[PDB]
């Protein structure tokens with residue numbers, strides 16, 4: 001492993017309705033074959049999950065994938081998906097910035113037609129730590145955004161594989 005990334009799934013905003021008036025949403029978060037899930041919150045389209053899911057990083061070029069679903073007795077309807085590139089986070093990690101003020105913004109990632117960003121994403125230092133604030137717009141669904149906060153975790157050493 002090269003490190004860990006704490007993915008705090010903060011909230012879903014205006015998610016799709018999949019059970020007539022509301023939904024029972026959860027997120028599956030993947031990095032390749034690695035997969036984790038948030039809790040389910042019942043009968044909301046604005047879930048305040050605030051669930052932190054920690055991914056082991058082996059290859060930072062593999063996207064982090066997020067899939068939202070409705071929990072249901074018969075079929076768990078999809079409620080959109082998105083993905084995120086953690087290479088910008090890793091780029092800032094490699095700058096080895098230390099000793100600065102909290103919330104020192106050092107890199108910004110802009111939305112474009114290929115990525116899933118809803119707005120400019122900021123990568124910042126709150127020491128020792130490298131963090132990223134992300135809002136993702138969901139694909140393959142009529143509405144919905146997911147708000148995330150990422151945090152890099154270094155794996156202490158020990159060096160030379």
Ligand SMILES: [K+]
Pocket residue numbers: 018019070072075077
């Ligand atoms: K349904």
Ligand SMILES: [K+]
Pocket residue numbers: 018019023024070071072
């Ligand atoms: K449901």
